[PDB]
Amino acid sequence: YKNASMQGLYIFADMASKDMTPEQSNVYRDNSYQQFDTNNVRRVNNR
Amino acid sequence: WQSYRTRLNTLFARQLVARATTGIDTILSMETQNIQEPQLGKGFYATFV
Structure with missing residues (x-):
């Protein structure tokens, strides 16, 4: 799954949607993945 | 009245x-305060240093 494509959006204190750049989305993947899950099963998210 | 607007x-x-x-x-937020208003009549916007 690693290095697979991923999309993200920022939600700031005041409400605004900032789409994420593939480089950003990637650098958030690297520490993010394994907190989200495969088929039929689910994981939990944390900071 | 005076050139004040x-x-x-x-x-x-x-x-x-x-x-x-x-x-x-x-x-x-700060950005709620930066929302612009149309200028007063005519007039010439400038910055001085």
Whole structure:
């Protein structure tokens, strides 16, 4: 799954949607993945 | 009266309410204050250093 494509959006204190750049989305993947899950099963998210 | 000009109407009230309806931190942001108003009559915008 690693290095697979991923999309993200920022939600700031005041409400605004900032789409994420593939480089950003990637650098958030690297520490993010394994907190989200495969088929039929689910994981939990944390900071 | 003197060459002074003072704006007595503000047009973003609707936008201001909308932005406020989301959250407290939306209306009190710095960026809520940067919403521009049309200039006073004619006039020449400039910056001095």
